[PDB]
Amino acid sequence: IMLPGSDYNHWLIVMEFPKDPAPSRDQMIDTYLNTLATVLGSMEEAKKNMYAFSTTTYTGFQCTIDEETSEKFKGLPGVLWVLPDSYIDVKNKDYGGDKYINGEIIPS
Amino acid sequence: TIMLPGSDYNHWLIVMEFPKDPAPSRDQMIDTYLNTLATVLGSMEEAKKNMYAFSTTTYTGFQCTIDEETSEKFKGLPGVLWVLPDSYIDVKNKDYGGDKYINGEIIPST
Amino acid sequence: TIMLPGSDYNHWLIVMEFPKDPAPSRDQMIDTYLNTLATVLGSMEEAKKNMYAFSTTTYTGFQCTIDEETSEKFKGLPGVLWVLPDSYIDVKNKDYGGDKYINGEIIPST
Amino acid sequence: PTVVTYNTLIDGLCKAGKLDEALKLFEEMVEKGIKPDEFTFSSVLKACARLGALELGKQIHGYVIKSGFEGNVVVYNALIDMYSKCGLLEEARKVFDEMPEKDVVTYNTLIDGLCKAGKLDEALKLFEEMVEKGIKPDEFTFSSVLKACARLGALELGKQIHGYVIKSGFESNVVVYNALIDMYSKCGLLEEARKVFDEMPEKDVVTYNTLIDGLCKAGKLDEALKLFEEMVEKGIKPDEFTFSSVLKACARLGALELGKQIHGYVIKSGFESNVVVYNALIDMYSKCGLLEEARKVFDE
């Protein structure tokens, strides 16, 4: 069985950042993109496939990758959790978080 | 050596084996215990006198006051599985366990 | 490889067994601790100076500054049950616990 | 229809194994704008742990993080228990290392998972850490740590624990003291295990069992037997494991006459059809030469 939206092609990748001090919001997002760019092989493909993230409620990001790709995140610096994403609103079929279109940051 | 409380070798557990399907009734088993005891002791009066306990539930056998030499005579008799020296179940009360048989009256256990 | 906080093997819990009917008084239990420690250390002055804590309630034992080789000398003495390395019971305050003994003053534990 | 009434339903469905119906309820109260909470996530996770529903566990975990519950003690304790019972102790530890607040239950949960995995060093290091941070171990901590010291031969730590247990007022605690008997026995010190036994005011089956096992592994077979009849004289009823230990004690000796009295006891206590007593009887009789008997035992 499965949470609505958990199709194992959407992944929640939560990272760990230092605390004294914290990196800026832009630094955390940059860390998400570079981390995802590492796994995919290009920054162009990381911006394509990161559809959401947070630097407040949690410090992680959400991306359209398959499951064997998502295993490549494990062991990478800063990667805490590699978890199948799930709908926060099943009606809209939407995964929540601050949205990332392709440079467009519209908060929530 | 080491002896279990109550194992004086003048008390014997004689375990038996009946057909499982269909099992003889509680009263047929009881009957068989006395008959088998009376065959070794020579009469039914000595059987009723010396059978102090039995079971038809948690086991199918009877307990009797006989010496070791007599308990040997049960081995290889029809339906006789085990010939084991009895022992207390409750050491405080010197109770050998099972349903009790006192001269024809049955007092079940717990 | 791993140790409890405060177990540096220079602090020792000596647990003693006492008669039960009646138990001795608190003061007698204490003077058993002093005399026992004095027996190993060679003098009462040494025992009084090296006993830093005891109980006669939660446990019946004393706690003393001795090294490991010395602590072995308690084993086989009458009344000695356990020789165990002492340890902190409050780690932040570096406290071994028990009623404290400071040159004859007793400060009960809280 | 409150959060509490939706949670009472999910919990019942969760305890009955009905994860599909539990999740439908979850998604329904989410749909109706009724927020899940501590009990909801912890209810679902506990079922995931019972059933090994790792994947749902991992998705809930995702859902837990996205809805702001990182660090919540009840939820994260359940996360630890779920990852632990699904075999994933590195993940259990990650959840632990991330919790800003830890209670004795937090530590106990991760200690119990580690001990079941044979990761005994990490459990003792974790116990030390718990003492270092001023969290008071409880009956379950002392018991699990002493059992770990016993399996590890970690005598010196066990003896420090013994001191700590004495000072914290645990002398009368049978669970902890059963653990001390085990620790001394498995560390080669039957005399100290005997001392522990003879000091305990209360003794149950497990304390007789623990000390019998130590005598038998030491080859102190006659001492094991004297103790077994001591147990019977005090009214403590033997169990599956008592019978298996003293029958093998008998099946390691010319103790047939005693094995026969125990066989009678075993029959009268309801233990003849018990699998390990089965084999302990078959074993005892075989080592005593009478091989028909063993066949008689087997042929049930």
Side-chain angles (χ1 to χ4, degrees), chain B residues 2-5 7 9 15 59 81-82 84 86-87 89 91 96, chain D residues 226 229 232 257-258 261 263-265 267-268 285 293 296-297 300:
Chain B
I2 312 297
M3 303 284 276
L4 241 37
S7 293
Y9 281 76
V15 176
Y59 55 99
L81 225 203
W82 302 114
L84 304 173
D86 211 13
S87 60
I89 298 190
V91 184
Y96 282 97
Chain D
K226 311 166 188 168
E229 73 142 291
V232 153
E257 299 283 39
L258 187 64
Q261 313 158 24
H263 193 186
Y265 196 111
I267 288 174
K268 297 152 72 186
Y285 271 137
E293 319 299 325
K296 292 171 164 213
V297 183
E300 297 165 359

PDB file of all heavy atoms in Angstrom, chain B residues 2-5 7 9 15 59 81-82 84 86-87 89 91 96, chain D residues 226 229 232 257-258 261 263-265 267-268 285 293 296-297 300:
ATOM      1  N   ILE B   2      19.916 -36.910  43.819  1.00  0.00           N
ATOM      2  CA  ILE B   2      18.877 -35.882  43.833  1.00  0.00           C
ATOM      3  C   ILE B   2      17.532 -36.535  43.545  1.00  0.00           C
ATOM      4  O   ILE B   2      17.379 -37.231  42.535  1.00  0.00           O
ATOM      5  CB  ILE B   2      19.184 -34.772  42.809  1.00  0.00           C
ATOM      6  CG1 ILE B   2      20.631 -34.310  42.952  1.00  0.00           C
ATOM      7  CG2 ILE B   2      18.270 -33.579  43.018  1.00  0.00           C
ATOM      8  CD1 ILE B   2      20.917 -33.683  44.293  1.00  0.00           C
ATOM      9  N   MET B   3      16.557 -36.307  44.433  1.00  0.00           N
ATOM     10  CA  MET B   3      15.217 -36.878  44.338  1.00  0.00           C
ATOM     11  C   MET B   3      14.168 -35.780  44.374  1.00  0.00           C
ATOM     12  O   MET B   3      14.257 -34.847  45.180  1.00  0.00           O
ATOM     13  CB  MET B   3      14.942 -37.848  45.480  1.00  0.00           C
ATOM     14  CG  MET B   3      15.940 -38.956  45.539  1.00  0.00           C
ATOM     15  SD  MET B   3      15.574 -40.141  44.255  1.00  0.00           S
ATOM     16  CE  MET B   3      14.345 -41.084  45.148  1.00  0.00           C
ATOM     17  N   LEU B   4      13.170 -35.907  43.510  1.00  0.00           N
ATOM     18  CA  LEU B   4      12.082 -34.941  43.484  1.00  0.00           C
ATOM     19  C   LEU B   4      11.191 -35.123  44.716  1.00  0.00           C
ATOM     20  O   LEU B   4      10.984 -36.254  45.173  1.00  0.00           O
ATOM     21  CB  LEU B   4      11.265 -35.110  42.210  1.00  0.00           C
ATOM     22  CG  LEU B   4      11.150 -33.965  41.207  1.00  0.00           C
ATOM     23  CD1 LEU B   4      12.443 -33.162  41.067  1.00  0.00           C
ATOM     24  CD2 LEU B   4      10.723 -34.552  39.863  1.00  0.00           C
ATOM     25  N   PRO B   5      10.676 -34.035  45.288  1.00  0.00           N
ATOM     26  CA  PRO B   5       9.852 -34.154  46.504  1.00  0.00           C
ATOM     27  C   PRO B   5       8.669 -35.084  46.280  1.00  0.00           C
ATOM     28  O   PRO B   5       7.874 -34.903  45.356  1.00  0.00           O
ATOM     29  CB  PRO B   5       9.404 -32.713  46.772  1.00  0.00           C
ATOM     30  CG  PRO B   5      10.328 -31.846  45.956  1.00  0.00           C
ATOM     31  CD  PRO B   5      10.795 -32.650  44.805  1.00  0.00           C
ATOM     32  N   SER B   7       9.017 -38.376  45.602  1.00  0.00           N
ATOM     33  CA  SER B   7       9.403 -39.529  44.795  1.00  0.00           C
ATOM     34  C   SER B   7      10.020 -40.578  45.707  1.00  0.00           C
ATOM     35  O   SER B   7      11.233 -40.742  45.793  1.00  0.00           O
ATOM     36  CB  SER B   7      10.352 -39.119  43.674  1.00  0.00           C
ATOM     37  OG  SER B   7       9.698 -38.303  42.715  1.00  0.00           O
ATOM     38  N   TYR B   9       9.324 -43.852  45.363  1.00  0.00           N
ATOM     39  CA  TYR B   9       9.298 -45.127  44.650  1.00  0.00           C
ATOM     40  C   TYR B   9       8.274 -46.101  45.243  1.00  0.00           C
ATOM     41  O   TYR B   9       8.340 -47.315  44.994  1.00  0.00           O
ATOM     42  CB  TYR B   9      10.701 -45.759  44.590  1.00  0.00           C
ATOM     43  CG  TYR B   9      11.587 -45.135  43.518  1.00  0.00           C
ATOM     44  CD1 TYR B   9      12.174 -43.891  43.709  1.00  0.00           C
ATOM     45  CD2 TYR B   9      11.817 -45.781  42.316  1.00  0.00           C
ATOM     46  CE1 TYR B   9      12.960 -43.307  42.732  1.00  0.00           C
ATOM     47  CE2 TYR B   9      12.601 -45.208  41.335  1.00  0.00           C
ATOM     48  CZ  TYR B   9      13.173 -43.968  41.554  1.00  0.00           C
ATOM     49  OH  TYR B   9      13.965 -43.380  40.592  1.00  0.00           O
ATOM     50  N   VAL B  15       1.199 -44.026  32.683  1.00  0.00           N
ATOM     51  CA  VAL B  15       0.580 -43.249  31.613  1.00  0.00           C
ATOM     52  C   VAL B  15       0.090 -44.199  30.543  1.00  0.00           C
ATOM     53  O   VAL B  15       0.773 -45.166  30.190  1.00  0.00           O
ATOM     54  CB  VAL B  15       1.557 -42.216  31.022  1.00  0.00           C
ATOM     55  CG1 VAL B  15       0.903 -41.512  29.844  1.00  0.00           C
ATOM     56  CG2 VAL B  15       1.994 -41.200  32.078  1.00  0.00           C
ATOM     57  N   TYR B  59      -3.450 -35.449  30.883  1.00  0.00           N
ATOM     58  CA  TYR B  59      -2.823 -36.707  30.489  1.00  0.00           C
ATOM     59  C   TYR B  59      -3.853 -37.797  30.684  1.00  0.00           C
ATOM     60  O   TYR B  59      -4.918 -37.577  31.263  1.00  0.00           O
ATOM     61  CB  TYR B  59      -1.549 -37.044  31.288  1.00  0.00           C
ATOM     62  CG  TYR B  59      -1.740 -37.071  32.781  1.00  0.00           C
ATOM     63  CD1 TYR B  59      -1.920 -38.264  33.467  1.00  0.00           C
ATOM     64  CD2 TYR B  59      -1.754 -35.890  33.506  1.00  0.00           C
ATOM     65  CE1 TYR B  59      -2.111 -38.268  34.844  1.00  0.00           C
ATOM     66  CE2 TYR B  59      -1.934 -35.882  34.859  1.00  0.00           C
ATOM     67  CZ  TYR B  59      -2.117 -37.066  35.533  1.00  0.00           C
ATOM     68  OH  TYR B  59      -2.297 -37.012  36.906  1.00  0.00           O
ATOM     69  N   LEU B  81       1.987 -47.033  28.238  1.00  0.00           N
ATOM     70  CA  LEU B  81       3.063 -46.256  27.640  1.00  0.00           C
ATOM     71  C   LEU B  81       4.197 -45.998  28.632  1.00  0.00           C
ATOM     72  O   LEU B  81       5.333 -46.418  28.403  1.00  0.00           O
ATOM     73  CB  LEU B  81       2.505 -44.929  27.117  1.00  0.00           C
ATOM     74  CG  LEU B  81       2.919 -44.423  25.732  1.00  0.00           C
ATOM     75  CD1 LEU B  81       2.727 -42.917  25.655  1.00  0.00           C
ATOM     76  CD2 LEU B  81       4.350 -44.815  25.383  1.00  0.00           C
ATOM     77  N   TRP B  82       3.911 -45.308  29.733  1.00  0.00           N
ATOM     78  CA  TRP B  82       4.956 -44.875  30.653  1.00  0.00           C
ATOM     79  C   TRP B  82       4.727 -45.450  32.038  1.00  0.00           C
ATOM     80  O   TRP B  82       3.599 -45.460  32.540  1.00  0.00           O
ATOM     81  CB  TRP B  82       5.029 -43.339  30.747  1.00  0.00           C
ATOM     82  CG  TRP B  82       5.278 -42.669  29.441  1.00  0.00           C
ATOM     83  CD1 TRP B  82       4.430 -41.842  28.766  1.00  0.00           C
ATOM     84  CD2 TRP B  82       6.450 -42.779  28.646  1.00  0.00           C
ATOM     85  NE1 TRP B  82       5.004 -41.428  27.590  1.00  0.00           N
ATOM     86  CE2 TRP B  82       6.247 -41.990  27.491  1.00  0.00           C
ATOM     87  CE3 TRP B  82       7.659 -43.466  28.793  1.00  0.00           C
ATOM     88  CZ2 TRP B  82       7.213 -41.871  26.490  1.00  0.00           C
ATOM     89  CZ3 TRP B  82       8.617 -43.353  27.791  1.00  0.00           C
ATOM     90  CH2 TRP B  82       8.389 -42.556  26.663  1.00  0.00           C
ATOM     91  N   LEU B  84       6.512 -44.370  35.323  1.00  0.00           N
ATOM     92  CA  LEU B  84       7.321 -43.301  35.902  1.00  0.00           C
ATOM     93  C   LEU B  84       7.037 -43.124  37.391  1.00  0.00           C
ATOM     94  O   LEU B  84       5.877 -43.151  37.809  1.00  0.00           O
ATOM     95  CB  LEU B  84       7.049 -41.963  35.185  1.00  0.00           C
ATOM     96  CG  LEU B  84       7.266 -41.986  33.668  1.00  0.00           C
ATOM     97  CD1 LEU B  84       6.829 -40.694  33.006  1.00  0.00           C
ATOM     98  CD2 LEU B  84       8.720 -42.267  33.364  1.00  0.00           C
ATOM     99  N   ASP B  86       6.112 -41.306  40.645  1.00  0.00           N
ATOM    100  CA  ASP B  86       5.348 -40.088  40.852  1.00  0.00           C
ATOM    101  C   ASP B  86       6.111 -39.114  41.745  1.00  0.00           C
ATOM    102  O   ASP B  86       7.066 -39.477  42.446  1.00  0.00           O
ATOM    103  CB  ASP B  86       3.983 -40.411  41.472  1.00  0.00           C
ATOM    104  CG  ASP B  86       2.917 -39.425  41.056  1.00  0.00           C
ATOM    105  OD1 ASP B  86       3.168 -38.656  40.102  1.00  0.00           O
ATOM    106  OD2 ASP B  86       1.833 -39.420  41.672  1.00  0.00           O
ATOM    107  N   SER B  87       5.658 -37.865  41.720  1.00  0.00           N
ATOM    108  CA  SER B  87       6.268 -36.786  42.479  1.00  0.00           C
ATOM    109  C   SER B  87       5.190 -35.764  42.809  1.00  0.00           C
ATOM    110  O   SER B  87       4.152 -35.696  42.139  1.00  0.00           O
ATOM    111  CB  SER B  87       7.397 -36.133  41.684  1.00  0.00           C
ATOM    112  OG  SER B  87       6.872 -35.591  40.470  1.00  0.00           O
ATOM    113  N   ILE B  89       3.217 -32.354  42.862  1.00  0.00           N
ATOM    114  CA  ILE B  89       3.028 -31.167  42.041  1.00  0.00           C
ATOM    115  C   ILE B  89       3.015 -29.903  42.889  1.00  0.00           C
ATOM    116  O   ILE B  89       3.522 -28.864  42.470  1.00  0.00           O
ATOM    117  CB  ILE B  89       1.732 -31.292  41.223  1.00  0.00           C
ATOM    118  CG1 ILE B  89       1.823 -32.472  40.278  1.00  0.00           C
ATOM    119  CG2 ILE B  89       1.509 -30.057  40.411  1.00  0.00           C
ATOM    120  CD1 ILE B  89       0.679 -32.506  39.283  1.00  0.00           C
ATOM    121  N   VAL B  91       4.398 -28.976  46.486  1.00  0.00           N
ATOM    122  CA  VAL B  91       5.269 -29.526  47.516  1.00  0.00           C
ATOM    123  C   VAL B  91       4.763 -29.159  48.898  1.00  0.00           C
ATOM    124  O   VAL B  91       4.897 -29.944  49.848  1.00  0.00           O
ATOM    125  CB  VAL B  91       6.707 -29.039  47.286  1.00  0.00           C
ATOM    126  CG1 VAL B  91       7.656 -29.676  48.295  1.00  0.00           C
ATOM    127  CG2 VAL B  91       7.114 -29.376  45.876  1.00  0.00           C
ATOM    128  N   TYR B  96       0.125 -35.016  45.051  1.00  0.00           N
ATOM    129  CA  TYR B  96       0.644 -35.628  43.832  1.00  0.00           C
ATOM    130  C   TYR B  96      -0.056 -35.158  42.562  1.00  0.00           C
ATOM    131  O   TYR B  96       0.413 -35.485  41.473  1.00  0.00           O
ATOM    132  CB  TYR B  96       0.548 -37.156  43.915  1.00  0.00           C
ATOM    133  CG  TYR B  96       1.629 -37.773  44.768  1.00  0.00           C
ATOM    134  CD1 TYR B  96       1.391 -38.094  46.097  1.00  0.00           C
ATOM    135  CD2 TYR B  96       2.902 -38.012  44.251  1.00  0.00           C
ATOM    136  CE1 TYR B  96       2.381 -38.643  46.886  1.00  0.00           C
ATOM    137  CE2 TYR B  96       3.892 -38.572  45.028  1.00  0.00           C
ATOM    138  CZ  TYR B  96       3.626 -38.885  46.347  1.00  0.00           C
ATOM    139  OH  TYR B  96       4.606 -39.441  47.133  1.00  0.00           O
TER     140      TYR B  96
ATOM    141  N   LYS D 226      20.530 -29.935  42.205  1.00  0.00           N
ATOM    142  CA  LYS D 226      20.161 -29.543  43.563  1.00  0.00           C
ATOM    143  C   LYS D 226      19.309 -28.293  43.537  1.00  0.00           C
ATOM    144  O   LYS D 226      18.315 -28.186  44.267  1.00  0.00           O
ATOM    145  CB  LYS D 226      21.415 -29.318  44.416  1.00  0.00           C
ATOM    146  CG  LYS D 226      22.413 -30.465  44.317  1.00  0.00           C
ATOM    147  CD  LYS D 226      23.794 -30.122  44.877  1.00  0.00           C
ATOM    148  CE  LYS D 226      24.803 -31.234  44.588  1.00  0.00           C
ATOM    149  NZ  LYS D 226      26.206 -30.813  44.872  1.00  0.00           N
ATOM    150  N   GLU D 229      15.579 -28.899  42.248  1.00  0.00           N
ATOM    151  CA  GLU D 229      14.631 -29.389  43.236  1.00  0.00           C
ATOM    152  C   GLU D 229      14.378 -28.340  44.313  1.00  0.00           C
ATOM    153  O   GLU D 229      13.264 -28.260  44.841  1.00  0.00           O
ATOM    154  CB  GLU D 229      15.105 -30.719  43.817  1.00  0.00           C
ATOM    155  CG  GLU D 229      16.257 -30.640  44.741  1.00  0.00           C
ATOM    156  CD  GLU D 229      16.091 -31.617  45.869  1.00  0.00           C
ATOM    157  OE1 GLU D 229      15.191 -31.373  46.697  1.00  0.00           O
ATOM    158  OE2 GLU D 229      16.824 -32.633  45.908  1.00  0.00           O
ATOM    159  N   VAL D 232      11.541 -26.416  42.995  1.00  0.00           N
ATOM    160  CA  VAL D 232      10.268 -27.119  43.137  1.00  0.00           C
ATOM    161  C   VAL D 232       9.800 -27.101  44.591  1.00  0.00           C
ATOM    162  O   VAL D 232       8.602 -26.963  44.870  1.00  0.00           O
ATOM    163  CB  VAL D 232      10.405 -28.550  42.579  1.00  0.00           C
ATOM    164  CG1 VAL D 232       9.431 -29.502  43.244  1.00  0.00           C
ATOM    165  CG2 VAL D 232      10.211 -28.547  41.067  1.00  0.00           C
ATOM    166  N   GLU D 257      17.268 -41.928  36.683  1.00  0.00           N
ATOM    167  CA  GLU D 257      16.199 -42.027  37.674  1.00  0.00           C
ATOM    168  C   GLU D 257      15.573 -40.671  37.970  1.00  0.00           C
ATOM    169  O   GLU D 257      14.397 -40.595  38.347  1.00  0.00           O
ATOM    170  CB  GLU D 257      16.731 -42.663  38.960  1.00  0.00           C
ATOM    171  CG  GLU D 257      17.284 -44.092  38.807  1.00  0.00           C
ATOM    172  CD  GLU D 257      16.200 -45.175  38.708  1.00  0.00           C
ATOM    173  OE1 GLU D 257      15.170 -44.927  38.048  1.00  0.00           O
ATOM    174  OE2 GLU D 257      16.383 -46.275  39.289  1.00  0.00           O
ATOM    175  N   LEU D 258      16.335 -39.593  37.807  1.00  0.00           N
ATOM    176  CA  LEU D 258      15.807 -38.253  38.002  1.00  0.00           C
ATOM    177  C   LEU D 258      15.129 -37.738  36.746  1.00  0.00           C
ATOM    178  O   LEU D 258      14.107 -37.043  36.835  1.00  0.00           O
ATOM    179  CB  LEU D 258      16.934 -37.307  38.412  1.00  0.00           C
ATOM    180  CG  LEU D 258      16.550 -35.888  38.813  1.00  0.00           C
ATOM    181  CD1 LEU D 258      15.689 -35.912  40.068  1.00  0.00           C
ATOM    182  CD2 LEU D 258      17.812 -35.084  39.028  1.00  0.00           C
ATOM    183  N   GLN D 261      11.577 -39.123  36.898  1.00  0.00           N
ATOM    184  CA  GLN D 261      10.693 -38.322  37.745  1.00  0.00           C
ATOM    185  C   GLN D 261      10.333 -36.991  37.098  1.00  0.00           C
ATOM    186  O   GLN D 261       9.211 -36.508  37.262  1.00  0.00           O
ATOM    187  CB  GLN D 261      11.337 -38.056  39.100  1.00  0.00           C
ATOM    188  CG  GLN D 261      11.951 -39.252  39.766  1.00  0.00           C
ATOM    189  CD  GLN D 261      12.996 -38.848  40.784  1.00  0.00           C
ATOM    190  OE1 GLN D 261      12.969 -37.740  41.307  1.00  0.00           O
ATOM    191  NE2 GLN D 261      13.932 -39.737  41.056  1.00  0.00           N
ATOM    192  N   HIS D 263      10.218 -36.458  33.786  1.00  0.00           N
ATOM    193  CA  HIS D 263       9.282 -36.859  32.741  1.00  0.00           C
ATOM    194  C   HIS D 263       7.853 -36.972  33.284  1.00  0.00           C
ATOM    195  O   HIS D 263       6.895 -36.476  32.675  1.00  0.00           O
ATOM    196  CB  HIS D 263       9.755 -38.188  32.148  1.00  0.00           C
ATOM    197  CG  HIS D 263       9.076 -38.576  30.878  1.00  0.00           C
ATOM    198  ND1 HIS D 263       9.300 -39.795  30.270  1.00  0.00           N
ATOM    199  CD2 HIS D 263       8.174 -37.925  30.102  1.00  0.00           C
ATOM    200  CE1 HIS D 263       8.561 -39.880  29.176  1.00  0.00           C
ATOM    201  NE2 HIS D 263       7.869 -38.758  29.051  1.00  0.00           N
ATOM    202  N   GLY D 264       7.697 -37.624  34.441  1.00  0.00           N
ATOM    203  CA  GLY D 264       6.401 -37.650  35.103  1.00  0.00           C
ATOM    204  C   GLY D 264       5.886 -36.261  35.433  1.00  0.00           C
ATOM    205  O   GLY D 264       4.724 -35.930  35.156  1.00  0.00           O
ATOM    206  N   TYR D 265       6.743 -35.429  36.039  1.00  0.00           N
ATOM    207  CA  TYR D 265       6.370 -34.039  36.287  1.00  0.00           C
ATOM    208  C   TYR D 265       5.980 -33.349  34.988  1.00  0.00           C
ATOM    209  O   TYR D 265       4.940 -32.688  34.914  1.00  0.00           O
ATOM    210  CB  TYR D 265       7.519 -33.291  36.969  1.00  0.00           C
ATOM    211  CG  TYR D 265       7.140 -31.967  37.616  1.00  0.00           C
ATOM    212  CD1 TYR D 265       7.146 -31.824  38.991  1.00  0.00           C
ATOM    213  CD2 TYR D 265       6.812 -30.857  36.851  1.00  0.00           C
ATOM    214  CE1 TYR D 265       6.816 -30.624  39.598  1.00  0.00           C
ATOM    215  CE2 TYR D 265       6.476 -29.647  37.447  1.00  0.00           C
ATOM    216  CZ  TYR D 265       6.483 -29.535  38.826  1.00  0.00           C
ATOM    217  OH  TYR D 265       6.142 -28.340  39.438  1.00  0.00           O
ATOM    218  N   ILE D 267       4.838 -34.558  32.196  1.00  0.00           N
ATOM    219  CA  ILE D 267       3.535 -35.052  31.745  1.00  0.00           C
ATOM    220  C   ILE D 267       2.407 -34.417  32.547  1.00  0.00           C
ATOM    221  O   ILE D 267       1.390 -33.998  31.983  1.00  0.00           O
ATOM    222  CB  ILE D 267       3.479 -36.591  31.832  1.00  0.00           C
ATOM    223  CG1 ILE D 267       4.336 -37.231  30.742  1.00  0.00           C
ATOM    224  CG2 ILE D 267       2.035 -37.094  31.727  1.00  0.00           C
ATOM    225  CD1 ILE D 267       4.448 -38.742  30.864  1.00  0.00           C
ATOM    226  N   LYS D 268       2.567 -34.324  33.868  1.00  0.00           N
ATOM    227  CA  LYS D 268       1.472 -33.834  34.707  1.00  0.00           C
ATOM    228  C   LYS D 268       1.285 -32.326  34.644  1.00  0.00           C
ATOM    229  O   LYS D 268       0.194 -31.857  34.973  1.00  0.00           O
ATOM    230  CB  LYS D 268       1.672 -34.251  36.170  1.00  0.00           C
ATOM    231  CG  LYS D 268       1.653 -35.762  36.354  1.00  0.00           C
ATOM    232  CD  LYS D 268       2.480 -36.240  37.541  1.00  0.00           C
ATOM    233  CE  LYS D 268       1.802 -35.877  38.856  1.00  0.00           C
ATOM    234  NZ  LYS D 268       2.645 -36.192  40.055  1.00  0.00           N
ATOM    235  N   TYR D 285      16.772 -39.372  27.128  1.00  0.00           N
ATOM    236  CA  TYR D 285      16.646 -40.822  27.065  1.00  0.00           C
ATOM    237  C   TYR D 285      17.742 -41.438  26.197  1.00  0.00           C
ATOM    238  O   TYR D 285      18.317 -42.471  26.561  1.00  0.00           O
ATOM    239  CB  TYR D 285      15.252 -41.193  26.554  1.00  0.00           C
ATOM    240  CG  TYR D 285      14.185 -41.341  27.633  1.00  0.00           C
ATOM    241  CD1 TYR D 285      12.907 -40.806  27.458  1.00  0.00           C
ATOM    242  CD2 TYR D 285      14.450 -42.029  28.822  1.00  0.00           C
ATOM    243  CE1 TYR D 285      11.927 -40.948  28.438  1.00  0.00           C
ATOM    244  CE2 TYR D 285      13.472 -42.171  29.812  1.00  0.00           C
ATOM    245  CZ  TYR D 285      12.215 -41.628  29.612  1.00  0.00           C
ATOM    246  OH  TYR D 285      11.240 -41.764  30.582  1.00  0.00           O
ATOM    247  N   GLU D 293      12.535 -45.735  24.467  1.00  0.00           N
ATOM    248  CA  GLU D 293      11.951 -44.573  25.118  1.00  0.00           C
ATOM    249  C   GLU D 293      12.020 -43.364  24.242  1.00  0.00           C
ATOM    250  O   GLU D 293      11.010 -42.730  23.969  1.00  0.00           O
ATOM    251  CB  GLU D 293      12.645 -44.297  26.430  1.00  0.00           C
ATOM    252  CG  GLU D 293      12.959 -45.525  27.244  1.00  0.00           C
ATOM    253  CD  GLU D 293      11.737 -46.324  27.643  1.00  0.00           C
ATOM    254  OE1 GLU D 293      10.675 -45.752  27.915  1.00  0.00           O
ATOM    255  OE2 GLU D 293      11.842 -47.544  27.720  1.00  0.00           O
ATOM    256  N   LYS D 296       9.648 -43.833  21.718  1.00  0.00           N
ATOM    257  CA  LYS D 296       8.349 -43.606  22.361  1.00  0.00           C
ATOM    258  C   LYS D 296       8.055 -42.109  22.494  1.00  0.00           C
ATOM    259  O   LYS D 296       6.942 -41.652  22.197  1.00  0.00           O
ATOM    260  CB  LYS D 296       8.302 -44.276  23.745  1.00  0.00           C
ATOM    261  CG  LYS D 296       8.304 -45.813  23.807  1.00  0.00           C
ATOM    262  CD  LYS D 296       8.487 -46.267  25.262  1.00  0.00           C
ATOM    263  CE  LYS D 296       8.114 -47.734  25.501  1.00  0.00           C
ATOM    264  NZ  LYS D 296       7.541 -47.958  26.877  1.00  0.00           N
ATOM    265  N   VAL D 297       9.045 -41.327  22.946  1.00  0.00           N
ATOM    266  CA  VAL D 297       8.844 -39.883  23.052  1.00  0.00           C
ATOM    267  C   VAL D 297       8.579 -39.291  21.672  1.00  0.00           C
ATOM    268  O   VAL D 297       7.601 -38.560  21.462  1.00  0.00           O
ATOM    269  CB  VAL D 297      10.050 -39.207  23.737  1.00  0.00           C
ATOM    270  CG1 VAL D 297       9.787 -37.714  23.910  1.00  0.00           C
ATOM    271  CG2 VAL D 297      10.357 -39.848  25.081  1.00  0.00           C
ATOM    272  N   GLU D 300       5.130 -39.503  19.275  1.00  0.00           N
ATOM    273  CA  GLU D 300       3.912 -38.761  19.596  1.00  0.00           C
ATOM    274  C   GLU D 300       3.733 -37.650  18.553  1.00  0.00           C
ATOM    275  O   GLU D 300       2.906 -36.748  18.697  1.00  0.00           O
ATOM    276  CB  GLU D 300       3.971 -38.183  21.014  1.00  0.00           C
ATOM    277  CG  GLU D 300       4.060 -39.218  22.146  1.00  0.00           C
ATOM    278  CD  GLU D 300       4.478 -38.603  23.504  1.00  0.00           C
ATOM    279  OE1 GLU D 300       4.714 -37.373  23.569  1.00  0.00           O
ATOM    280  OE2 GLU D 300       4.580 -39.352  24.504  1.00  0.00           O
TER     281      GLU D 300
END
